[PDB]
Amino acid sequence: LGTQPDLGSALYQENYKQMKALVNQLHERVEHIKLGGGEKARALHISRGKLLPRERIDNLIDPGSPFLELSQFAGYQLYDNEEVPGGGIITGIGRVSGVECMIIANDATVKGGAYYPVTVKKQLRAQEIAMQNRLPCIYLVDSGGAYLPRQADVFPDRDHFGRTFYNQAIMSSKNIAQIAVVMGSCTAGGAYVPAMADENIIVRKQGTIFLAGPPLVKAATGEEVSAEDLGGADLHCRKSGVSDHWALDDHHALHLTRKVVRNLNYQKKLDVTIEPSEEPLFPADELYGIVGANLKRSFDVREVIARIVDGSRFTEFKAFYGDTLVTGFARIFGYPVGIVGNNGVLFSESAKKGTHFVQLCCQRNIPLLFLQNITGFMVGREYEAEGIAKDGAKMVAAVACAQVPKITLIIGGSYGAGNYGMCGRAYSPRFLYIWPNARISVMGGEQAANVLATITKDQRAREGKQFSSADEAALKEPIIKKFEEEGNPYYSSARVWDDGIIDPADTRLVLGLSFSAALNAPIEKTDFGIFRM
Amino acid sequence: LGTQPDLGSALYQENYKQMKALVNQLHERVEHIKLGGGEKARALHISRGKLLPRERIDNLIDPGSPFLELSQFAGYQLYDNEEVPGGGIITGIGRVSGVECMIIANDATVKGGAYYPVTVKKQLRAQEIAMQNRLPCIYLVDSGGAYLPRQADVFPDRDHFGRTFYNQAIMSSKNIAQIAVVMGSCTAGGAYVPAMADENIIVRKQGTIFLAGPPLVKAATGEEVSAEDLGGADLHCRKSGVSDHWALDDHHALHLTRKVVRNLNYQKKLDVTIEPSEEPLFPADELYGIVGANLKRSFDVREVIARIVDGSRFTEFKAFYGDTLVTGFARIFGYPVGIVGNNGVLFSESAKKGTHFVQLCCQRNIPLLFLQNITGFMVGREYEAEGIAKDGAKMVAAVACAQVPKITLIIGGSYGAGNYGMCGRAYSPRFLYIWPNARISVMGGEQAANVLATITKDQRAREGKQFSSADEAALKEPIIKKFEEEGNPYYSSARVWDDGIIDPADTRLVLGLSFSAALNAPIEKTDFGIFRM
Amino acid sequence: LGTQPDLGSALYQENYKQMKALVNQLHERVEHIKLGGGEKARALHISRGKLLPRERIDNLIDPGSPFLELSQFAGYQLYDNEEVPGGGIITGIGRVSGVECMIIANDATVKGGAYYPVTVKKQLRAQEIAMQNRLPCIYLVDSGGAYLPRQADVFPDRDHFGRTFYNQAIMSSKNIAQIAVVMGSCTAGGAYVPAMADENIIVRKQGTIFLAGPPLVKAATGEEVSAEDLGGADLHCRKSGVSDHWALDDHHALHLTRKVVRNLNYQKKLDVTIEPSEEPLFPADELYGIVGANLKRSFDVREVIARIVDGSRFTEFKAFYGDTLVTGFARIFGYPVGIVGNNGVLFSESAKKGTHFVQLCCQRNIPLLFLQNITGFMVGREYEAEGIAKDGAKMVAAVACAQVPKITLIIGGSYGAGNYGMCGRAYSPRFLYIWPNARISVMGGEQAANVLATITKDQRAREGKQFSSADEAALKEPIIKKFEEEGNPYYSSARVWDDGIIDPADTRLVLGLSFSAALNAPIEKTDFGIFRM
Amino acid sequence: FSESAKKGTHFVQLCCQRNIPLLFLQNITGFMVGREYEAEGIAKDGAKMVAAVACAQVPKITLIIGGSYGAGNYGMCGRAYSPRFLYIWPNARISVMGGEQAANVLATITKDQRAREGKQFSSADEAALKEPIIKKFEEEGNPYYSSARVWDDGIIDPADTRLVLGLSFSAALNAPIEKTDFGIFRM
C-alpha cells in the first residue's frame, strides 16, 4: 500500500504546518504536567528523602525499557481554580523483571496526593486495563486521602473509591498479582490498599498505615500519638504483621519489588501466529501533511494504514463493496491484525461489509483495530426504507460481542451512532487513543447549529413572528462554540474518555506496545447474539 | 427472636411520631412523581390515543401481580430549574405470563421523553439488574432523543448512552430475551433499540423509527417527508422489515408482548432448598417506634430481624464473640438467607466473625442480606497495632468475592470503610435499599467538623494567630450543613446510588420480591483471593 | 425366585439350631459392649451431669429413626489384658433433621476416652465412609488424648492420628459439612477437632479445649491454672472465639446440633430410577436352616437372594454359562442392584461371565452387591494352559475400576485371590459385612495344613529321614488351630477388616440402609484399563 | 507461636496460587505453652496451618532435620498429610512428644497421685519412673526405628540433601499441577 505524497503541493505544506503546531502544543503541555505540583512541592518532597514519583517508575522498570503512560491529561483544566497535573496519579504499563505490569503511583507533590474525583476514575481505568489483560498491578502508595470538599463524587457510588478495593479482591481471586509498595503515608481507605495486596512492601520511616489517623485518634480518645508510632514500617513489619517486606529507603523498596515480581512463576504464552517484524515502507511523519488539521477535507485512510503496518502490506477485504469502509488483514510488529477504518459516510453496504469482516476475525481469533474518522450515516428516505438502521445495528451488535482484543484510534471526527459502530468507549476496547486533531460529540457542531436554525425558524413561523438572518446567527454562534469546546481532544482527555492523546508519528509504536500487552490474556471464543437479517 | 416494645414509653412514642412523619413525606412526594409531566402534558399524551406510561405497565403485567418499581426518586431536584419526575423513565420488575421481567418504559410526558444524564444512568442500572439475574428485558420505547444541552454527560463515555446498545447485544448473546415495543417516536440512537432487540413490536401510527429524523433529512438533502412515511409501522413491518409484529394500538401492542414472552420456552428452576413460608411473630409497623429518626440513639438490630424473617426464627452464629456484629441464618418467604447486621462499632473480632460467616454462606450457596447501621471503626493505638486494618480488609475481600446473591439495606448511618465492609454500592449487591432515616457519606458530618476544628486550631497556633470559639463555630457550621444535605436519602436517591427509598413497614415484602427475582440465575461457585491471615 | 425349604428335614433342623446359637452368641456379646466402661465408670460419668455416649446419639437423631452402627466389635480381645468395648468410640449413620449424617462419638467411660490404635483406625474408617458417600460428619468430642504406651502405633504414620485432621480439611474443601460438639475435655490433638470444624458447639462447663493441658503448662512455665480457665466455653465462646455456639448442657448442645444441620441447605437427589418397594416372598429367618454353620456343605445362593430382594424377583444373566457364579438384576427397597454371588469354585467361564456383567452395571450406573462364599479357583494343568489366571485377573481389573457403589457381604468362606475378585476390603467397597459363620484367610486352614504336610514329607525323603503319620498330625494340628482363630469373624471384626457382624435375618434392612446412604453422592462415569483379552 | 502459624498459612496460599512446589524443613520443639496463648486461640491458629497444608495441591516434600513432635509434625506436612516424599536426617527424632516431656508429665502426675493417696514418692522413686519412659522414646524415635517401618522414604546423608531434593522434585513434576481448593478458614 501507500503512495509518495506531493511534498511541493500547497495542501501538503499547509497540512504539515498545522499538524506540526498541534504536536508542538501537545509536547510542551506534557512537559508542564511532567513537573507535577511544582518546584516548592518537589523540593519539599526530596527534602524528606523520598524519590520523585516519576523517578520511582524509572528505577522500577527494566533498564531502558519503554514505558506506556496512560491518561497524561487527566484533570487538565477540569476544576475551575485547582490545577491537578495528571490527576495526582501516574499510571502506565512497563516491564518489570521481564513481565509486563500495570504501575499505579500516587503523585504526592500534587495536592499532597489527595484523591480527586478524576483521580479515582483514572485509577479505576488502570485497574480495568490490568484485569482485562491479566497484568500484575503494582501500587506505589503515597496518598493523603480523599478530597473532602468533593466527597460526594468520590466515596458513595459503584464507580467511586470503594470500587478500588473491589477490583483488588477480584484480581487476586484470578491469580493476577497485586503488589503494594507503601512509600509514604496512607490513611483511612488508603491503609486498605497494602492490606488487600497479595504481597506488601513498606519503607522504614516514610511509610505509615492506619485506619484512623492521629487527628481522629485524638478526637475520639484524646490521645496524642505520632504517625510513625501509630503506623510505621516497624509496627506493621514486626508487630501488626501487615507488612511482608521491610525496606530501608525508596531505592531498596524498588529493588525488593523487582524481586517479588520475579517470583510470580509466570511465563507469557502467545495464542496468535507470529511473523518477523518489518518497518513500514513510508515515513510516519508524512502523516502530518496527509491528514492535517481540517476535518472538512478528506483523505484516504489507506495512506494512514500504509505507514503503520509491517512492510506496508495489506490484504483488502471486499474492496469494491461499500467502499466508504476499508477492511483488511495486516501485521504490526509481527502480530496479525484486522483493520477497520472509515473512508466516508457509512452506508448499508458498509455496515454489512463490516459485520461480515468482524465475524471473520472472531472466527480466527485475530485482534481488531478500528480507525475512527466518521462524518455520520447516510440520510435519505430510501435508505431508511431499506433498513439502514437495521444494517447499522448489525455492526454494533457484532462489535459488542467480539471477544478478540480491540483497539480504537480516533484520527478524525467521532459523531453520533457512528461512534458506537466503530467501537467507541462504551464498547470496551482494550485501549482507546485519539490524535490531536480529533473531535467527538453527539453530533457535529454545525449539524446542531443548523438543526436549531430550522427548528426555531419553523417555530417562529408558527407563532407568526419573524426570525431574521441576524437572528439565525445569534442562535447558531453559542452552539458552535459549545460543541467546539466540548469536542476538543483535551476536553475529552481531561476526563478519562480516552487513554491518551498521541503524536501521529508515534502511532505505530503505541499500537505495538498496546497489542503486546493485550496478548497477555488468552483469547476466548466469541458468542454472538441474533443477527437481524 | 423479638420482644414486645413498651408502647407507653415516651421514647417509643417520640420515635414512632418522627418516623411516621418521614414515611408520610415519602408517600406524598411519590404521589407527585406519579403524575409525570403534568396535566397539560398528560392530556396531550392521551389526546394522541396513547396510553399513559404507568397504565401501559399495568396492562402489561399479570392481573393483580405486584410490581417492584426502582429508583422512583431519580432526578429529584438534581437539575437546578428543571423538574424531571422519575428521571423521565420508569423501571421495575414484574411478572409477565408467569415470568419475571425487567420493564423499561420511557415517560413521554416528561420533557417529551428526552434522555437526561440521570435517565441514562437509571436505564443502565436496570439493564445491569436484568443481566445479573437473567431477567428478560421489555422496552416500552417512547423517546425524544438525547438532551442536547447536556450532551457531554450523555453520549461519549463508557457508561453513557452508547452502553445501552452494548448491554442489549451482550444479554442477547446469553439468551436473555430482549423485546422492544415501539409505542411512539424513536430517533437517532432510539431507532437502534428496536433494531437491537430479538423480537420487536411497533404500533400502526404512533411508532416511528429512523436513524435520521425529518429535520436532518431536510437539512442534508432538502426533502420534506413526514415521520410516518420516513418510519412508521407499515414501512418497517412490510418493506424495511425492521418490525416483527404490527399492532393496531397500545392495548394490542401490550397483548402481543405477553404472547411473545409466553413463547420464550423458559422455566424457573431453584438452586436452594425451600420451606413453607410463615409471617413474622411481631407487627412490622412497630419498627417505627423501635428505630425512630435519631441516629445518635442505638437499637438492637435483632429487633429489626425479628419483624422480617419467617416466624421470627433466627439461628445466631458466634453470638458472644464480636458482639457489635450480628450474623445468623433465617428464612424469608421460605428462602434461606444469611443476615449480617451492625450493632455498634466494628472491631477486629467483628470483622473476623463476619469473614468467617461469609465463607459459610458461600460454601452452602446461601443468599446474603446486609443491614448497614454503622458508626465507624474502632479508633485506638492498640487496635492499629493489632492490625484492625488487616482485619477490616479481610471482610472487604470476602464480601467482594462472594458469588451468592447479595442484598444490602441501609437502616442507619453509612460512613467510611464501614460502608465497603458491609457490601456498599461499589461491591455490586443485587439490590440496595435505604430507609427514609438513613445517612451516607465519607464520614459523619460531626467528624468532618471536629477534624477541621482540630486542624485549624493547631494551624492557627503554628502561625501564632488565635482561633476563637466563635471562630470554631463559624468553621464547623458550613461543613455540618453540607454533609447533612449530601447525606440525605433523597440526595442519595436522586442520583442513582440506591435502588429506592422504602417504607420500613414494606421491608419484608421488598426483600421477598428482590430475593425471588435474584434466584432466576443459577448460583455460581465462589473463588476467593488470598486471606491475609 | 426361591423355594419352600423342608422344615422337617434333619439337615434343616441341624442348620437352624447351629446358626441360631451363633446369633444368640452375637447378641449377648453386643449387650456387654453396650455397657462400655462399666457401672463404676458410668456412674461417675453421670455424676458430672453428662449424658451417656449412646444416649447422646439417641437424642441427636430423628425420633424413631433407625441407626446403623458400624464396627461394634472393634478391639474385642485385641489387647492382651485391656478391655476396650467398641474401641472406645461409637460410629454409625443416622438421620439428623432429615439428613443422613455420619456420627462419631468418643466413649469417655472406656479408659477415659483415650485413643487406642484401634480407636484411630475405626474413626478413619468412619471418615472414609462419609467422604465417599458425601455424608456430613458430626463429632461428639469427649476424649482423653492418645494412649502413650502405644504411641508408636497412633502418632507417626500416614494412617495414624494425624490423618484425622487431614480428612476433616479435605471434606471441608468439598462442602461436606464438619460439625464438632465439644461435650467434654479435648487436649493436644483433640483441641484441633473443634478448631478444624466448619461450625463448633461447646458445652458451658464440661467442654475444655487447649493445645497444652494444665499439666504441661505447669511443667513448661510453672503456672497452676484450672482446665476451665485454660479452656472452657466462656473463654473460647467469648474471648478466644474458637466456639461458634454456647450450650448450657448436653441436651442443649444436641438441640443446637440439629439446628445447625437444618441450615446446611442440602437436599438429597437420586441418580437412579426408583420403583415401589415390596417385601420378599419368603421369611428371612429361614436363612438359618438353609445356610447353617458348616462351610463344607454347599447351598444355592439363589435361596439367599430370594429372601432379601423386593418380591423375590430376579433376572439372571447368562444363567447356563459359568454356573458356579450367579449374576442378575434385582431391586432392594426400590433401588436397582446388580448381584454377583458365588455358587462354587471359580472357573474361566465364571470369571468371564462376571467381567461381562460388571461392565453392564457400570454402563447403566447400577449399584453392585457382592455375596462372597468362595472355596478357591479351579486347579488343573489344562486350566492354567487356558489362562485361568488371565481370566481371574480380568474380573479383578473390572471390579477395581468400577465407580458404581459396591457393597460386599461375606456369607461364607473368603480365601486367596477369590477374595480380591469378589470385591474384598482392598477394593474399596462402600460397605463390607460378614455373617457370624464366615471365615477369611489367605487360604483354607486345611489347605495350609495339607500343603505343609506334602512339603515336609518330601523334604524328609530328600534328607532320607522318615515323617510318620503321627508326625503328619503333629505338623497339621497347630496350623489348623492358627487359621481357625485368625479366620474367625470376631478376629476379623475386632480389627477393622469389616464394618460389622450382622444377623442374617437383618441382611435386607442393613443393605437397604447402606445403599440408601451410598446414594447421597452422585454416580461417576467408569473408566476401565486395558482388558487383557 | 500464633504469629508463626499465621505467617505460614499466608505463605502456603501464595505458593498454591502461583503453583509453586513446597519444601518443608521440620525441626520442631512443640507449640508455645501459656494461659494467654490459649486465650488468644493458639489452637485456632495452629489449626489454620494444618488446614492449609492439607488442602494444598502443589507438590510437597518434607525433610526432617531434627525433632518432630506432637501437632507440630502435622502442621509441617507430616507423613499423614501426603507429601510426595518424606526424608529424615540421621540425627532426627520423631514421636508424639519429646522423651523428656513424657517423663516429666508422668513424674508430675504420679507425684500428685501419691499425695492424694497420702503416700510419698521419693526422688529415687521419680528416677525409677522416668528412666523406662526415656528409654522407650529413644528407641522408638530413632531414625532407624522410624525407617525400618515405612514412615519415611529413606535416611539420607546431609551432604546429599541437594541431590536428593533435585531428583525428587524433578520426578514430582511429571504430573500436571492442579488448582487448590481450600476449606473454610476459621479466622
From Swiss-Prot, chain D:
N6-acetyllysine PTM positions: K119, K135
Residue(s) carrying N6-succinyllysine: K119
Domain CoA carboxyltransferase C-terminal span(s) in chain numbering: 1-179
Stated consequence of mutating I61V: In MCC2D; mild form
Signal sequence residues: none
Subcellular location: Mitochondrion matrix
Function: Carboxyltransferase subunit of the 3-methylcrotonyl-CoA carboxylase, an enzyme that catalyzes the conversion of 3-methylcrotonyl-CoA to 3-methylglutaconyl-CoA, a critical step for leucine and isovaleric acid catabolism.
Entry similarity comment: Belongs to the AccD/PCCB family.
Record's disease association: 3-methylcrotonoyl-CoA carboxylase 2 deficiency: An autosomal recessive disorder of leucine catabolism. The phenotype is variable, ranging from neonatal onset with severe neurological involvement to asymptomatic adults. There is a characteristic organic aciduria with massive excretion of 3-hydroxyisovaleric acid and 3-methylcrotonylglycine, usually in combination with a severe secondary carnitine deficiency.
Assembly information from the UniProt record: Probably a dodecamer composed of six biotin-containing alpha subunits (MCCC1) and six beta (MCCC2) subunits.
Protein name, as recorded: Methylcrotonoyl-CoA carboxylase beta chain, mitochondrial
